[model samples]
Target: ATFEIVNRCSYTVWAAASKGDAALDAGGRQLNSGESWTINVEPGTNGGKIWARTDCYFDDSGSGICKTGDCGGLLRCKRFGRPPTTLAEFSLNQYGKDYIDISNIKGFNVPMNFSPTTRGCRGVRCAADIVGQCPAKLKAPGGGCNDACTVFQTSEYCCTTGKCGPTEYSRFFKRLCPDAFSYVLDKPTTVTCPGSSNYRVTFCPTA
Candidate 1:
């Protein structure tokens, strides 16, 4: 599967992706406003995540930190990014189907749209100005809204055990982006498309 990642935000974005132990797109790329990058996913890749890092400064060797979504301060990430970042997650060629979703469980930074370019599959988006409306208690240090789990780390928010439901924090996110996975155990919002389909992940997507 091919992922066309576009940055439409007024500022720059460092796009990042990771799958298992491997980093995609060499871990990250500096995408100026309106720029785009393409990444190809091999069949059977699972638990893949794509997100953007904002306000970053990387050296020639790709060493730097981002205000959001920093992964070990490396230009090429070998692990999942930090929280308070919007996520586009997918698994390719799983039993002949590709599953995808927009996840807010970590939190939200930029608006995003994840959609298939083929197979007539439905697209999912989270485009609300989460930072502008972020509740003070859930706000991150620099910017973006942090998930309750990330901020508090309690079972009530993390759902560490037993059955749990949404909190006011998760509801805040759900209200803005009803299509996203708001909490750890939120109902399944996964969408499926043909294994052969290509996808687009856009930051600051249009309404």
Candidate 2:
């Protein structure tokens, strides 16, 4: 059988799988950013791993894991940044079931919320990175102070040195957000002053 894939975001994407892995063509075709296209995929391969790499970016400066696209890939977006909750449609039999992997799939009308008051880490694993000691520049954490987002560059790695240091966010999160998973608004997690003058120590969760 053949399974199909679709792109419903407002940008062009580069889809690639183990069967097809190339930066340009990668594993799939160039689907319009906001368009959706299906491919002749092997139905329920189980071992099938599909991910979207977008030409767009969430934060161009530090290469922050593009909530939608960039170099870091989905790993970053999931930990720190978020592309709004996406819902996918997967046609599965008894194996996959009526479930869709909305990893980063976007909708035609996906509302944009830049409110820092509510946002996720956009990393692969929340702790040991944004909270632990992962490079914030990569927008993802390797697991405890490799680079961090304190600075920006092609080497592109940082861990927050200012008030927004990994320790700070981690403590703040731990204090207000017992679970630093996704956006939390019920209580104050981050401080608006993430940093002082630097975008580093922001006292997020400002009220």
lDDT of each prediction vs. the true structure? 0.90, 0.27
Clashes of each: 0, 44
| lDDT tens digits, residue span 35-81, model 1 | 98988877788899999988899998889899999999987777888
The residue-level lDDT of candidate 1 at 42 comes to 76
Give all TM-scores, in the order shown. 0.97, 0.30
For the record, the alpha-carbon RMSD of candidate 1 to the native fold, in angstroms, is: 1.1
- Tell me each candidate's RMSD, in Å, in order: 1.1, 15.7
Q: What is the lDDT of residue 44 in candidate 1?
A: 84
lDDT of 2 by residue, 1-207 (tens): 233334444555443333212221123344554444434434442223334444433333333233332333432222221222211222223342322222211111121111112132221111111223222532322211211122232121222232232333333323432433221121222222111111111111121
Model 1 — which ten-residue stretch has the worst lDDT?
A: 19-28
